[PDB]
Design a binder for this molecule. Structure first.
Ligand code: MG
Ligand code: MG
Ligand code: MG
Ligand code: MG
Ligand code: MG
Ligand code: MG
Ligand code: MG
Ligand code: MG
Ligand code: MG
Ligand code: MG
Ligand code: MG
Ligand code: MG
Ligand code: MG
Ligand code: MG
Ligand code: MG
Ligand code: MG
Ligand code: MG
Ligand code: MG
Ligand code: MG
Ligand code: MG
Ligand code: MG
Ligand code: MG
Ligand code: MG
Ligand code: MG
Lengths: 203, 147, 102, 210
RNA sequence: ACGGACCAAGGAGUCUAACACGUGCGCGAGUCGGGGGCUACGAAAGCCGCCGUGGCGCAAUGAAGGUGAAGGCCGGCGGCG
RNA sequence: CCCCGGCGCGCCGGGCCCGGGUCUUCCCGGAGUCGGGUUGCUUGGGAAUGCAGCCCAAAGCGGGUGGUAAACUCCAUCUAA
RNA sequence: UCAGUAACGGCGAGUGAACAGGGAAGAGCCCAGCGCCGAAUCCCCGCCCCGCGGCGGGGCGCGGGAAAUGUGGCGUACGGA
């Protein structure tokens, strides 16, 4: 039951123990490159409850993403339009920094399949995420029925289509009165349905 | 069909029924309901009083099923049962009254417009108006409340 | 007197014999088991308290309870979440007094 | 521009609606495609009922529809438990199961339990190996007569209880439906405030007393 | 005052949606199957009826809680006188 | 007349050594996530529908939802990361 | 269908869903965790039999590695052991 203790310990992120580990680890992650293959999960309990298994064909990558919002990439701040669209600062990006992290791992390792990721550190400038990827051609993966699903071509670049857990959170999905925007599967699916004129033969 | 319409009669007539002076121009006066508080004010005030402004409380998440209450007047009450139901009750001597269940016919409240035949009846319903209850009682009937 | 079921009032509704059954198992989510309590008490021994909880406990020592709740609420966010936290920190404080007395 | 009397209209044609017009010329084609798949499915699963698994009886929510019963999604685990059908075995013999659904009242529960017992009585069960029957399998004489059923299985209907005419009693004549209705609304409306006023009076009188 | 050298061919109130009124037909306090289902022309046509859900109509009024559409005469009693 | 497929029936070598009910004793959950403040966008969502950045930062008969902000109190309904 | 409706909106112009109800189709499941099982798990190489244009089945190696920083079997909120 060690994973029970570790999970609870990683909930005390302002304790003396955990603050010391986060601070020194963030320092160490900061001296490496923005994309860096990790030898093992820094968080074995968090990794495994996100689908990671300790077998050949599962790999970890540590991604560093710059913190903060999204500046509008217009020259000299000119947007050339109406005042409603003059904003340059204080704009936010539609997707989380964790999702950006997974996309940067998924794009680099185009032959792997991103599964999930998790938080490992941050300072004022960077957030650090470890991404769980799978090699879809290792026979430890192809011959396991419980992981054959992610070797299918329909699961190529999940992180790049908002399919991972981090990515799908910015899509406004969910059941109930809070998520009417995406009835039909997505915002555009709801829009097309609500904006298509049904002209029946007999009308 | 296009053969029965004005265009076929307006061939050779230059302006096509829109005049030589005013012509048919694109959008004089504005598009749609423009001008309602302006150059179109007389039409709106004259024909659409009340159109501008706000009145009364807002209600978020209105659910029209909660206020579902179909009504039936007393003058249509006996149409909910069969014809033989009325005549058999009218001519019988024991004095048994038939039960008319308006909820089964799809109504909830019973309303008082009309006059009933001089014939006892037992009426089941969720709701009654005051005058409906008295008219039902004036013929020797009884009101029964269901849920 | 004669009484009927009604669609209005304090006893409104169609009458149905209520069936009593075992509550769905999903309804015990968040119930504290003795083992999970042991693990959480152990991590408190290893870890300790966060700075805002230490500062909140200084307020409770001097009996500044109204300011202790206001400080906690500004940190956790809600009145109900703050009330639970204030009670928990009070119990910790009271337990240390007992340990000192012993 | 408005012209004399008329209605004020706000057509929703201020977008590129012609880029998203859905015609229905494929409608006959869809009807033939769906029909051709119902038949091909019925042949595949024969002699199992073409409609599908038996569905329970449920009452429609809200006050507009609670007078009607219709087919639900699946039988509740309490209904299946009372009928002595294992929940994993239920689907294998054409019974639909809904683990989400609850049973609040007994009548609805017993209505669906009798439904399951009636369906179980009409079930003709072919042995897993044709040549080797087993304990619960139907006899060969009733396997010959087995034929595919069309339409929903044991269709659900709203049946009304006819009440015969009866002599009206003086107690029903004296009942005041409207006065009863109006006073019931008022009591519900003032129940909370009345108790609050009563509680204060008790405290108000107690303080003088002691 | 502007266009027009000449000939041919092409060339401009349409279609979708909504509304109003008029007219024609069907049924009629009802009416409508349009979605769905059943059974070459035919992607048609026929059917459904415990497929009428549903729309509109059959009830109005109030912001709402809500309420929601004729009376008189005769006889008897109680109260006022 | 060719070929491909589907559906059936036997042999060989393997794998499984498989279930129901009633009692007794035990066990049971996803965290820089929820939640809160603020900013910007977004929605019919209006004392703030969804999303995102920064700050704060959980609990365990708890947590979320219960379409008007908030305290108290019952209820209903689910079980997020 | 709800419904151009609840709602949004220099409450102007304009915008605008959901639940219920009727249908098409219909299918349900798996981990982490908590535990018990001597890691009971997996990959690759070499040899023998079978198959071999979808590279797999069985047998044998004091063959190599992965994996106790956790693989496999039982089991997942409908409770489970
Ligand atoms: Mg955007
Ligand atoms: Mg898919
Ligand atoms: Mg979130
Ligand atoms: Mg002329
Ligand atoms: Mg004209
Ligand atoms: Mg002209
Ligand atoms: Mg003019
Ligand atoms: Mg002029
Ligand atoms: Mg014009
Ligand atoms: Mg004009
Ligand atoms: Mg000129
Ligand atoms: Mg000229
Ligand atoms: Mg007409
Ligand atoms: Mg044809
Ligand atoms: Mg979960
Ligand atoms: Mg924008
Ligand atoms: Mg907007
Ligand atoms: Mg409220
Ligand atoms: Mg309408
Ligand atoms: Mg818009
Ligand atoms: Mg619905
Ligand atoms: Mg169907
Ligand atoms: Mg486990
Ligand atoms: Mg579940």
């Amino acid at each position: 039951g060690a994973y029970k203790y570790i999970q609870e310990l990683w909930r005390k992120k302002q304790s003396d123990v955990m603050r010391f580990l986060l601070r020194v680890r963030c320092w160490q992650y900061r001296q490496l490159s923005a994309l860096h293959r990790a030898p093992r999960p820094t968080r074995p309990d968090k990794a495994r409850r996100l689908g990671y298994k300790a077998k050949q064909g599962y790999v970890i990558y540590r991604i560093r993403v710059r913190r903060g919002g999204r500046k509008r990439p217009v020259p000299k701040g000119a947007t050339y339009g109406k005042p409603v669209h003059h904003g340059v600062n204080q704009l936010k990006f539609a997707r989380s920094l964790q999702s950006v992290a997974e996309e940067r791992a998924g794009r680099h390792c185009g032959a792997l399949r991103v599964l999930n990721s998790y938080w490992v550190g941050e300072d004022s400038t960077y957030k650090f995420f470890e991404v769980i990827l799978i090699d879809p051609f290792h026979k430890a993966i192809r011959r396991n029925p419980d992981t054959q699903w992610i070797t299918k071509p329909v699961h190529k670049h999940r992180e790049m289509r908002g399919l991972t857990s981090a990515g799908r959170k910015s899509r406004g999905l969910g059941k109930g009165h809070k998520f009417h925007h995406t009835i039909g599967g997505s915002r555009r699916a709801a829009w097309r349905r609500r904006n298509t004129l049904q002209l029946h033969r007999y009308r | 069909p296009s053969r029965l319409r004005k265009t076929r009669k307006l061939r050779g007539h230059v302006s096509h029924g829109h005049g030589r002076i005013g012509k048919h121009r694109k959008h004089p006066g504005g598009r749609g309901n423009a001008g309602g508080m302006h150059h179109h004010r007389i039409n709106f005030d004259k024909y659409h009083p009340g159109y501008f402004g706000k009145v009364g409380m807002r209600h978020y998440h209105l659910k029209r099923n909660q206020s579902f209450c179909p009504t039936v007047n007393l003058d249509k009450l006996w149409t909910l049962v069969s014809e033989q139901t009325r005549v058999n009750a009218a001519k019988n001597k024991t004095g048994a009254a038939p039960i008319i269940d308006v909820v089964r016919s799809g109504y909830y409240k019973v309303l008082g417009k009309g006059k009933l035949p001089k014939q006892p009846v037992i009426v089941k319903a969720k709701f009654f108006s005051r005058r409906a209850e008295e008219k039902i009682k004036g013929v020797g009937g009884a009101c029964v409340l269901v849920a | 007197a004669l009484r009927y079921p009604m669609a209005v009032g304090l006893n409104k509704g169609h009458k149905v014999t209520k069936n009593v059954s075992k509550p769905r198992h999903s309804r015990r989510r968040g119930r504290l088991t003795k083992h999970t309590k042991f693990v959480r008490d152990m991590i408190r021994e290893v870890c300790g308290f966060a700075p805002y909880e230490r500062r909140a406990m200084e307020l409770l020592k001097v009996s500044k309870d109204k300011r202790a709740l206001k400080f906690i609420k500004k940190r956790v966010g809600t009145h109900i979440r703050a009330k639970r936290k204030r009670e928990e920190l009070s119990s910790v404080l009271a337990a240390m007094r007992k340990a000192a007395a012993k | 521009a408005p012209s004399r009397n008329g209605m004020i209209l706000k057509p929703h044609f201020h977008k590129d609606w012609q880029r998203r017009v859905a015609t229905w010329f494929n409608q006959p084609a869809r009807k033939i495609r769906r029909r051709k798949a119902r038949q091909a499915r019925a042949r595949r699963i024969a002699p199992r009922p073409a409609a599908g698994p038996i569905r329970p009886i449920v009452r429609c929510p809200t006050v507009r529809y609670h007078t009607k019963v219709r087919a639900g999604r699946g039988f509740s685990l309490e209904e299946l438990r009372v009928a002595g059908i294992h929940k994993k075995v239920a689907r294998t013999i054409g019974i639909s199961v809904d683990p989400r659904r609850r049973n609040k009242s007994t009548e609805s529960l017993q209505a669906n339990v009798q439904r399951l017992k009636e369906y179980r009585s009409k079930l003709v069960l072919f042995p897993r190996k044709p040549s080797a029957p087993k304990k619960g399998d139907s006899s060969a004489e009733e396997l010959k007569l087995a034929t595919q059923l069309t339409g929903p299985v044991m269709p659900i209907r709203n049946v009304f209880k006819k009440e015969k005419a009866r002599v009206i009693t003086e107690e029903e004549k004296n009942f005041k439906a409207f006065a009863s209705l109006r006073m019931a609304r008022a009591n519900a409306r003032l129940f909370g405030i009345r108790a609050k006023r009563a509680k204060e009076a008790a405290e108000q009188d107690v303080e003088k007393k002691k």
